[PDB]
Design a protein around this ligand. Structure first.
Ligand SMILES: Cc1nc2c(cc(C)n2Cc2cnn(C)c2)c(-c2ccc(Cl)cc2)c1[C@H](OC(C)(C)C)C(=O)O
Length: 132
């Protein structure tokens, strides 16, 4: 699909919130454990994401995620416009006993996902370089 398209969703595990961004064309994932499903957290995550990748458009499965003034401010400033979550919960479960904190097991799972086999990590850089 278009190389600027991302999907963002918030999942739940162990009483905490995981925000999951998927680069649609590639399957590459960037995830983070957040204190609460708040618009401040979504806005901050979108500023970080957009500084690292050319984010053009963002989709979500919960449109109310994007209603806060603060999320709209982040999209305004960065020039943003408007399944993989169970493959990620699968990998998290496999490595969970190897980390104390869930946040650590999440980043391990992102690592495993992105480098598994090309890999999602390799596809996203190919797709984006080719576009340039
Ligand atoms: C809380 C913690 N303490 C750790 C490690 C490793 C070590 C020696 N210590 C100190 C320790 C634990 N027990 N003893 C007998 C000593 C780790 C860790 C580092 C790299 C990976 Cl890949 C996975 C875990 C984490 C990890 O947290 C971090 C990533 C630091 C926020 C986690 O959440 O487990």
């Amino acid at each position: 699909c278009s190389p600027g398209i991302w999907q963002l969703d918030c999942t739940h595990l162990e009483g905490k919130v995981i925000l999951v961004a998927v680069h649609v064309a590639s399957g590459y994932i960037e995830a983070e454990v957040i204190p609460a499903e708040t618009g401040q957290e979504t806005a901050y995550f979108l500023l970080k994401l957009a500084g690292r990748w050319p984010v053009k458009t963002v989709h979500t499965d919960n449109g109310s995620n994007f209603t806060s003034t603060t999320v709209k401010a982040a999209c305004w400033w960065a020039g943003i416009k408007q399944s993989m979550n169970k493959e990620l919960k699968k990998i998290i479960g496999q490595v969970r006993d190897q980390a104390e904190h869930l946040k650590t097991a999440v980043q391990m799972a992102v690592f495993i996902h992105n480098h598994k086999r090309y890999s999602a990590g390799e596809r996203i850089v190919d797709i984006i370089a080719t576009d340039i």
